[PDB]
Amino acid sequence: LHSPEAVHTALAARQLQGLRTIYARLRARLMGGHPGPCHPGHSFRLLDSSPCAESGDALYYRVVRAHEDAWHILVAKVPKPGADVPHPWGLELQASLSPHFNLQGLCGLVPEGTLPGAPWRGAVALAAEVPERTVAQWLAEACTQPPEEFVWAVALLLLQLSAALKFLEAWGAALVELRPENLLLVAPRGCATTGPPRLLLTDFGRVCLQPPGPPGSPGPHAPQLGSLLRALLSLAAPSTTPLAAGLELLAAQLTRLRPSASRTRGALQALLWGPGPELALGPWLRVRRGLLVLRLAERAAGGEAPSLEDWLCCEYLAEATESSMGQALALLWD
Amino acid sequence: SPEAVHTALAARQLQGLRTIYARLRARLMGGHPGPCHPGHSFRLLDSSPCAESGDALYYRVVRAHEDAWHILVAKVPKPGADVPHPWGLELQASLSPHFNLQGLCGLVPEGTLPGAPWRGAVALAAEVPERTVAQWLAEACTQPPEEFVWAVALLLLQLSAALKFLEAWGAALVELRPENLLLVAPRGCATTGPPRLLLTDFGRVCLQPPGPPGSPGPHAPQLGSLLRALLSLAAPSTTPLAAGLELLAAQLTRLRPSASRTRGALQALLWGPGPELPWLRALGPWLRVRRGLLVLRLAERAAGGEAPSLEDWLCCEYLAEATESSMGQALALLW
């Protein structure tokens, strides 16, 4: 109204409120369908006579929990014969934590005599999620993708792993080692079927209490992500794209500078979408937030669903700030 | 250089809005059955019409073109029907398909479907009728809300689009009657909201060679009279749109405006500004803001799993094609 700049501010304020509404609606569907806790009135019957998935520490079978003429599908996690538990408290933590997009949740336990005809004997915990493949099983096929196609797919799975780890670092606990065979992949709920899978962390036997320490401390997982990132990158076909060049520099920075999981997510999101080192940043983020909303509207016109990558992108752009992008760029060009 | 970024953003959302309109229009006009050939096979679906219009009984028929699946409907002449202007029926076969016109795909003579309830050779329409406008009004005006005039104004904009196509042609309809108009669901972009309107009454459409304005819209004084009848059937005039329709009916009979001027003023009541907007100076940033808000609303609906309605496609047609001179006419005709 007689001030083009006030109109520009009102448009940024409303499209950002819409961007948070878009994120919250997609998150509510993406995290929907969670089964309630197990009760004495629930009848448990087996689906899989052989493992539906295998991790490094356990075998997984589906079980149907029937009640009130309906049911939920839960997974029984059966530890492999000879498997150890370096940190038993991490299993007590798994049963104490609320649901998280990238962590394996529990809905209860099947005690002895409650599930007839099982492949195993003894009380078993019930996981809320249903597995499809391990990260190692995905790599066995995925390493045949074109250079940039494979590397992008891995870079987005790494962003999910950093978030799962950020929760744990803010919580006050850490993994002693990273093992892709205990990282499981499933299709995301309510998202396009051709996008990236949802990443679940299951290795709670390796999670231990680790106090955050002083404000100048190193990130407890940084040298594990640096070495793992280089081993995963050595599986990609060669490319000259900035994406692969930034991921190799970030691996050197993870072992050299030792950033936290929240600083790691910032630089990785900045490499995936962010500006170059030349920035100043406000106008860029305001244009990119508006462009994702236009792409979502243009594809909706064709009856196309958003993918998990678009929910993760809209999450970065909605949470991105000038101070956060300053830190993200600083690691990238240093 | 923020001024350079704001110019680039307006151009980037404009090509996206035109792409959204073209993709939703392509879904709405998708599957149009092709012309009838010796390769087509037909089967009867019913013994009673899917729509009963003033001068036609509409029966649904299956067609297959080399095993390509199509549904078409026979326009069986209703007993007592006539043709005051036979040229208008030649015009219906002549013109290209249009979203709000009743299209034809060819003739099916008697004997193709031995079990048919009709006799004689009957042409088959591309669209599949569900009800007439008079049939919708009988129930729809029984328990209207005060905002009911919203559903009527949107069907009126569609009828004005069908009449604008004929007015751009060499043609006019001499007698306008809601009992001869048809409503169907939109294809590919379907919701429970307003139906697609089809203009059917070509038996009464005559030649219109005049150049000078004369009466600019031969259909306007007829729409003004029908709109006053519709406003007395609807809920009390408590919504600004009902008051806008009351003065619009007086203007339709007083000024006899063309369908293109009726669509401008009617779109201004539906989505555009009133006299609160000289006033027209605000239209530049008003279209840029309203165009961006519709793109944002479509993305927020998609985030919730809600498809766009035919109203949202008509809204994006109005906003993508509206200009400062078109909105200047729209507002000047209303006030």
Numbering used by the authors:
A (entry chain A): 128 to 406, 419 to 473
B (entry chain B): 130 to 406, 415 to 472
Provide excerpts from the study.
PEAK pseudokinases are molecular scaffolds which dimerize to regulate cell migration, morphology, and proliferation, as well as cancer progression. The pseudopodium-enriched atypical kinase (PEAK) family of pseudokinases, also known as New Kinase Family 3 (NKF3), is composed of three members: PEAK1 (also known as Sugen kinase [SgK] 269), PEAK2 (also known as Pragmin or SgK223), and PEAK3 (also known as chromosome 19 Open Reading Frame 35 [C19orf35]). Crystal structures of truncated PEAK1 and PEAK2 lacking the unstructured N-terminal domains revealed that these pseudokinase domain-flanking helices fold into an “XL”-shaped helical bundle and facilitate dimerization by forming an “XX”-shaped high-affinity dimerization interface termed the Split HElical Dimerization (SHED) domain. 14-3-3s are ubiquitous regulatory proteins that act as dimeric scaffolds to modulate their client proteins through a wide array of mechanisms, such as altering protein-protein interactions, inducing conformational changes, regulating subcellular localization, and sterically blocking access to phosphorylation sites.
We observed both PEAK3/14-3-3 complex and PEAK3 homodimer particles in the cryo-EM dataset; however, these particles exhibited orientation bias which limited our ability to reconstruct high-resolution maps. The addition of detergent to combat the orientation bias required us to work in a higher protein concentration regime, which shifted the particle equilibrium toward the complex, limiting the number of PEAK3-only particles. Nevertheless, the available PEAK3-only particles were initially processed in CryoSPARC and then re-extracted and imported to RELION for 3D classification and refinement to further alleviate streaking artifacts common for samples with preferred orientation. This yielded a low-resolution (4.9 Å) reconstruction of the PEAK3 homodimer. The limited resolution could be due to the low number of particles in the resulting reconstruction, especially impactful for a protein of this small size (108,034 Da). Another possibility is that the apo-PEAK3 homodimer exhibits conformational flexibility that is reduced upon 14-3-3 binding. Globally, however, comparison of the PEAK3/14-3-3 structure with the low-resolution structure of the PEAK3 homodimer alone did not reveal major differences within the PEAK3 dimer, with an overall average RMSD of 0.623 Å. The overall architecture of the PEAK3 pseudokinase homodimer within the PEAK3/14-3-3 complex, or alone solved at lower resolution, shows significant twisting between two pseudokinase domains instigated by rotations of the SHED domain helices, αJ and αL, relative to PEAK1 and PEAK2. These differences are thus independent from 14-3-3 binding and intrinsic to PEAK3.
